[model samples]
Target: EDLRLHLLLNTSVTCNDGSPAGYYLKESRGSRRWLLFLEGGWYCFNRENCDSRYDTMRRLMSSRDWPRTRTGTGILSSQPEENPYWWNANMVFIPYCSSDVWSGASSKSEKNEYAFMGALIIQEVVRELLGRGLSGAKVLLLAGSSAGGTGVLLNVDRVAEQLEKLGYPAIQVRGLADSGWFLDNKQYRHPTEAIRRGIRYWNGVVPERCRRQFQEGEEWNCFFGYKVYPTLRSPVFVVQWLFDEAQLTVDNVHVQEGLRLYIQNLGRELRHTLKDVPASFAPACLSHEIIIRSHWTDVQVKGTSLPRALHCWDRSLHTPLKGCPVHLVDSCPWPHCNPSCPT
Candidate 1:
């Protein structure tokens, strides 16, 4: 329960408004397990949207309101009664101030009022943690939800590579991405222009392995979860709602005529996208994100809750268990089919 604030004082890393980037750390002394979480706020792909965000959601783009101490909740909660499995791990909560979905690599410039250094900010934090006993950690679980969730997909492999390059070959890096799986509109074979514009506006950096699969100017394709999942070297646990609310909005699909059919199709596409992922929990709920909330345990797929499934996956990696319910996905055909789904 010892959560403290630490700002990045030694690098060019800064939030959109050039405010110092920082994270909240809750340490359980002597535990080699670490959970690094990213806070998720929606991102802007262009200057106009970013300007609009600067006016409304300024807290997400600036650390001006950050408190000296933060209380951890959900998986970040140190109380075993709240988080049974990872309650004792070192918890780090990184705020979403970059407005880049943690993908941008640009710094502050005279041409623009905002700096998009989401990716660089994460790297600097990890480097800072290395000096703070993260070097001695045996397990590193990089997790996030929503934009932060997509951030994990975009940065998990890079983090693993960074650790190895930093000479921490013994550390096991994994990702727990909650509600970050974005899908393409397969019916039209058209990719999301929003993320593509984000790549352009932020000078985004996609992982090299996935970037090679696309042609020039098409590296934006790597922003999608399914497109990048195959390129990941580290184990990732995806917690996504089959009927993702944000995805529906991104695709311009809404609750209207033939909505049931659309929901069913979305569920099918989600299953198809996650077919190769061995560690995932996809429920037939019409929500967006969940992991950082206490209610995450209320939703279940095939009688297994997300937290339970994650614990099973964790043990499967270490203890090598058999027949564990790690790949939990709801087979129901429509939205909110799972009785465990919260209303």
Candidate 2:
């Protein structure tokens, strides 16, 4: 089925450039399961940064050029072959135009160059979905990749809170955050100040428990998956590459013979960071995000493929199944050590 555009009539929920915030939907026939996948792009914190983003990737910060129709791929695919676990679920592809990693709560203003309303957009979209079968949804998996994947960590509990507030408490809301597990390790001096500045500019909203854990100005720490994951009340499944390419880039690690050490160290940190997450899959690979990749099912951890893990998770939750392996991680040290990893 072709995913068609459905623009929000509420003009207040506009994108960064004041265009309407919208989602592409492909509803299934009598399927109570829903997959609301957030599209990802890098973010900008301030006026100059956002302006530069608009100039470089206008479509990401504005919906002015969004296509009338789109074809879902990977997890969003309607074909049972490509998306075996969630092929028939009500699929929603939410374009990321806010550029706040979907954590911003402020609206556009004269003083501010653009709106940082990603958080509000998520709420509004769900509000709209309530009228379109979501009210009766048996399972709603809020999933994303890259920055959008981080958004799941920052907003999953809030989403659950919102659902309960709206009287849909029975609809099980879960999170599938892929490749957004970031470490605050200073092995290569990755600047954490960027998050501070971005949060200040975006008026970012963290979970209530996480919010209290930090003081007046340390809220930015909540943006990190390691910091916020423990505070989360909703069950979430994390998917991260052991040697994430994007993380390596930001950490200023480029290839050399000694690069093996950095990758191995990163793998160890990632493993440590995700040790408590019972429903996570971290394959030892050199990629960034894989949930949206065509070969998503090809990647494996300890001989258990990702799609298989996800299916087991689904069954364990909804159907009460046994032998469901939720936490699957590669024990290999080097990148691409997994035999089943996509080439």
Candidate 3:
């Protein structure tokens, strides 16, 4: 079956520059099953960074000249051999423009130079999809990559809980956050508190949202996914890497020893801290994000691949996919996280 992507120019949906937020919807086999993918582009936390982002060309600064998104991988794919269960399901791709990880209610900057409307984007986009057919969805998976992954973890509960109240009560809502896990800075106290302050300055909604579910002064805990597991009503899957190049700088070449140490503490802490609610995929590799088609097979543990484990976990109604779904190349050398890098 051939799937043609339809572009929906959300006139009411605007970016930091007041540009309309747009998304692509691809029709497929099931009307009751849907996948909403949030696109990722790091973030800009302050005036200087936000200014540069607003002026950059070929970027998400504005959606005036938005390019058409033609292809996808993993659950977004329409091929059964590739995505398995979600192959033919309705897929909605939400492009990331505002740098708040899809959770920003603030608007305008430096005399209306930029807008932080991420939180509004998610609300509007979901409402649009609901009116367009997602209201009937039986299985809804909200997935994101990199910074976008952080958005899913933060908003999945709100999305799921709100939907049930909107009259659709039987649907199963799930979430997947790929490469959104942040290295724990739990040991850092007071001196490095500026980091949290900077993040809040970027978008105050984060701490505000965290405050609704936690005590004051701990709102910064919202920065990490593992810290919010108890608050999430819907099940979520976490995909991560030990010595992830994007996060750690100690390892560039002598990867083994560094990653081994990284994984050692990370594995121990995750289990001890969260109490096993999220299904985890912690492969010992240099790869960062593995949701893309080619990287899915590249990420495996024991014998199961990332996509396979994700599919199974999604079906698990998510009881913390056990036995570690890490990766194995089988015949080739380990892989790095380059866009053109092969599996």
Candidate 4:
């Protein structure tokens, strides 16, 4: 018998202000196999009744009609209610996001670096889960969009290591960083000019140290310094859109260049490590002349912007590029094929 589980996690900003969030958990009946779809960001479990930023996501997931265990309701549900499936599998959904750390900082670069730090927390969460008896074999995948995308890249290795430390064989943890911000620095041949110009505008808005960090290339360091090539263990899917101004702008090009240089320095080992990683890059069909038409269409109230939305799994809101095909395993054609690969 074969079974698949799905855990849908909403991104962080969407989980802001504690609004009611939802996810789907699927598992085969009469079998231990299950899939947990975890959404990114925080959620307000009792939106109609209460308000708080720190509501436990575990509680919210248990109540939403998934299968349940029989120990006086379950750890997931705080109260007795509808239970959809019997013999609740060990798989569970954990909600996480980096809003607090990112927003608390004044600089964009600082926010970005701190956002990376926030991923460390996710490592702790996965470790705790393993400690509680959730083995790697039970986890089918760890996926997210946007900031969650960053989470998957940054934390998957740590999570796998924790699982191994607990005596569980590493599980297959695939990642999808849709519209993820992976840039290269050397793209900017003249970093000094770019740094000086950026400082004029961002110095006041962000901390002096952060400004200095960008000037000294520390902001680029935060993302590129990591050993992504060595640490990555699962199949990865990177979906990027060329027309996405925020990600494709000249400034971003510089960052992308920096990333490329860092990866290049890793040399042959990096290529060997990433031989199997799958990436999909798509070009936005809209032209610079028709900017408005090219922009992502859906706009939500107090939600993620068009660029941010590219990271979500909400198919109802955005559509993938026409020709771009979904890559299930090792490789697939990218941006040229699907202009909306990020979507």
Clash counts for all predictions: 0, 0, 7, 27
Deviating ranges (above 4 Å) for candidate 4: 1-94, 100-117, 128-133, 136-139, 184-231, 248-343
lDDT tens string, model 1, 197-316? 888888889888888888679987887899888988889999888888888777666545466567778899898888888899998888765687866667778877777888998888
lDDT per residue for candidate 2 within 1-343, as digits (tens), equals: 3889988878789889889999999989699999999888879977787888899899888899999888888999988889888988999999999998898888778777788899999998999988988998988899999988999998888889999998888989999999888887755633478778998998888888989999779988887898999999888999998888888888887656566677778899999888888888998888865587766777778777888899988877764345668889888888878887667
What overall lDDT goes with each candidate model?
A: 0.85, 0.86, 0.64, 0.34
User: What is the C-alpha lDDT profile of model 3 across 237-291, one tens digit per residue?
Assistant: 7766643555543222233775545545644454344336446665555555557
Q: Which candidate should be chosen as best, given lDDT against the real structure?
A: 2
Write candidate 4's Cα lDDT for 159-252 as tens digits.
5565677677745444544433334433323332432332232221222333345555443222321234233555555433333333334334
Q: Which stretches in model 3 have alpha-carbon errors above 4 Å?
A: 1-10, 29-31, 109-112, 186-199, 207-209, 213-217, 249-275, 318-343
TM-score of each predicted structure versus truth: 0.95, 0.96, 0.80, 0.40
Best by TM-score: 2
Please identify which of the two predictions, 1 or 3, would achieve the higher TM-score against the true structure. 1
User: 166 in model 3: Cα distance from truth in Å?
Assistant: 2.4
Consecutive 10-residue window with the lowest summed lDDT within model 4 = 285-294
What C-alpha RMSD separates each model from the true structure?
2.2, 1.8, 5.2, 15.0
lDDT order of candidates, top first:
2, 1, 3, 4
